soluble acetylcholine receptor
Amino acid sequence: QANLMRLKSDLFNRSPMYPGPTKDDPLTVTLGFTLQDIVKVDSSTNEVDLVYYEQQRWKLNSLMWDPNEYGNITDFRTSAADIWTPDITAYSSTRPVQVLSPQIAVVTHDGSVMFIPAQRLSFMCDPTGVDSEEGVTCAVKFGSWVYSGFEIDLKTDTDQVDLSSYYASSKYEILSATQTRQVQHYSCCPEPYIDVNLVVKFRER
Amino acid sequence: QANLMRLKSDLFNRSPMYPGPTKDDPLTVTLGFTLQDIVKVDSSTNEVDLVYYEQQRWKLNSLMWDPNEYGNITDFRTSAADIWTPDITAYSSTRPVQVLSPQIAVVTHDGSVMFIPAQRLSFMCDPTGVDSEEGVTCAVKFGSWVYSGFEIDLKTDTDQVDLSSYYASSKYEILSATQTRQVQHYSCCPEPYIDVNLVVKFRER
Amino acid sequence: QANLMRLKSDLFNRSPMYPGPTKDDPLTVTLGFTLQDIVKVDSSTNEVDLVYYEQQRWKLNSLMWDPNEYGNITDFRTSAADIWTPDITAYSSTRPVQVLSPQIAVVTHDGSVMFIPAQRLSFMCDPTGVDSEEGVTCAVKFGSWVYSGFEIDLKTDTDQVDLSSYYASSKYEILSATQTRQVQHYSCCPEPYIDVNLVVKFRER
Amino acid sequence: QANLMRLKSDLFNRSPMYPGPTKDDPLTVTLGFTLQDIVKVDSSTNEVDLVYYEQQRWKLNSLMWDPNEYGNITDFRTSAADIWTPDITAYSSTRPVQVLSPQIAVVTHDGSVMFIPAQRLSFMCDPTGVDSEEGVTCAVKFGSWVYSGFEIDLKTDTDQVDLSSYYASSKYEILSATQTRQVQHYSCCPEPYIDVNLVVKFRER
Amino acid sequence: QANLMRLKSDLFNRSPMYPGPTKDDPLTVTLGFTLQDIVKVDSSTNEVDLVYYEQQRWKLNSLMWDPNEYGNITDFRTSAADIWTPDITAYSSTRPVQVLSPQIAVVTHDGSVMFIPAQRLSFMCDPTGVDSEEGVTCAVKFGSWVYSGFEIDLKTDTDQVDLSSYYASSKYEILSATQTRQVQHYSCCPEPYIDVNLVVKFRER
Ligand SMILES: C[N+]1(C)[C@@H]2CC[C@H]1C[C@H](OC1c3ccccc3CCc3ccccc31)C2
């Protein structure tokens, strides 16, 4: 602990916080979903509720250190409030997202940060058909709220949503779940926007 | 980031916060709504739930900078807690407004601030009739809570509410949505009050 | 803003906060209600929900200033957390009060403070009869929770609750609404106890 | 206010906070309940909701002063966060306790503290029979969560729960309410444990 | 109190907080559950609510002291915010956990910390069958959210969940309740994660 205390002190107290990316200085955030459960479906409001882990990865120069200088410490855990985090948001939620997990990130010597909040999300989705055999399809985009693709580049490692943790006895079985990077384009504005479209196909039972 | 850190430092640490407008020193706030979804109607309580983005714009001299002096930075993003924000409020909500988006603002070198929170709002509205053609109409005024028109002047760029992001599969289709600036007077009160009246006409299906 | 910043600095940063009234040094708070809507009734728990504005006024010597010394500023707005506020509470609520408005007060050069929070309140009342023509009476008292009438004297400008903003299409029409100052005593104790009794008579439709 | 500011300063800023009682240095806390309302019973979960005021009294040497040295001030009010408070807890709640009143205490020159939070509490309780003639009896203990009877001695002034404020039109009439100090010995532990057992007998109507 | 104040000062003010364990410096946390009540099931959403005490024990060198140097004080109580706590989390909750008890820990001279928060948890569980005699079996996993088994080793004293406080009149009787230590080797990674699998078999009545 002697060493880790010093490391944390050097990174967080001697330095101002990282002010977020700029166009001259962009950042890549890697996003990945582990879909845990579809909890609730509401025919009368068209909200559906998901529980998932949202994996977030990025890398900052200002978070790098030589392990040799800190008793061979390769990585540590720290409160998410101690560091900058990206403003990744569901574009079509209907309630504030509920955080199910401690807000703690893992920081590695190479400057990598990994942050994996578990969340319950209510979002817009017409479940009409979910009792049929062919099921229904819903979609929610995740993106930075205020950063364009010039400042924050979104990325996935795979378009397969991780289903290895899906609640086996959920009221709803998952037929397919994909996470797809998209580049929104508008004649409002001569610059791109990046989101990840979480598309879930599911049915009852 | 070298430059942005210094810029934020110069603006926010060396200076006291902006103390809000005065009558000798008023401020114009521009308001605009992007209506996302009418989520829920409650006929027994006459309450209706909206999800929308509320675009807010204003301009402060104390937030200006010459880009040349900060590595050609034209704008940045910052926590809304870092700056003064107007106290725009729904005049007839029945529950505290739920914030759906990160509280982050965009500040431009000319001193412009842009803040676009996503919100869910329950407000007073008698939905009786919504199951027809011709549908039902509901209104809600948004205004400063404590500043008169002498201190804060409200404005819109257009009386058309932005409907380009309305949930196509909402339980409710929008017939029309306007945002209209009103000045009120009141027997009690020498000074003018300004609001923007959000009027939405909608029906089921 | 040059002057207001100085004024706020002089009042709030050079001075300790006001520590609340004492018996040798009492305070008068003026209370008034603007009743906005009766939202819901629950005949199964006997709770009713009101939305109202609660007008609070009091005056502190420590909040006075000569406008001439601060560029003719007569009054300003500030976060309620910057100043002492009285602990006015509903004596018979069943849920924590929900705050519907920004917590901002108006301070005037004469030492007056005006604070007008919008609130939603669930309180004990038995609505049995509300479907009749002659309606039903509910009452809730509000006073200080911890100050006796030796320290805080409550007062109203009028016993008429302001009904000029009542939701015209509420499920409940208001037959009468009064706000009445009351002094009780307790055996054990010389000190008088003050409250304002909000009595509301209402019926369906 | 001149004197009170100084008194508060002397007690709270020049001194560390009181660290809580020890076995060599125990503390008596006096508890009393004012039962305001039984809001609901839930027969499908065995939860029952109470609204009450829980009077708490204790006495600390470190909170004493000679009134003569502070302009004859006998007592003052202060935020409960300014002082140590005992960790009195319902042993069988099913939801976090909801605070209904400002968190302010009254401190007297003799070192007495009085703290009276109003709360809504959902506890365990099988209401089966509450519609019958004799109705039912639920109980909930209150006691320190982490201090044994060697550190915190609980006490009541009376075993009668104060019913003088019970909502006359509650859905439930109170047949009897007692508060009884229990010295419990657990077979895990050599220390004695105290609690106050709030026993309420009630029925419908 | 003279001595305790000094002890707390020496431990918490002169020293930085404990920065959490590292692989070169791991920590054992001992977990144990006291199951208090199964409160509610929702066969519609497949969620189940438990109330339990979660006993947590660990030991830190930095929390040791010689009782002789502090007036023979063997142990003390302190706010859990004053010390590091492990990030033990339910892996399959569907709502944020509700804390029912004061957040206070007991620290012993040997460096032991004991922390026993009472909680209400809604987690994923298909109750279909609970009305039979055989009953239904449900399972929830608890463990660190961000520390691998290289940093935090979980342990139980017993695989028997403590049932000596179970609500005798709960809607649900407990047929069996076990807490079992597991080693899991999830998706991405070469490093184990440790969990305690809380398995509860129950039925109505
Ligand atoms: C809101 N209160 C706290 C105000 C008015 C109703 C309720 C109860 C009352 O407090 C009294 C009281 C009177 C004299 C000295 C101390 C106290 C506080 C304890 C207490 C306990 C039971 C009933 C009344 C009071 C004052």
In short: The CA atoms of residues 80 and 103 of chain C lie 5 Å apart.
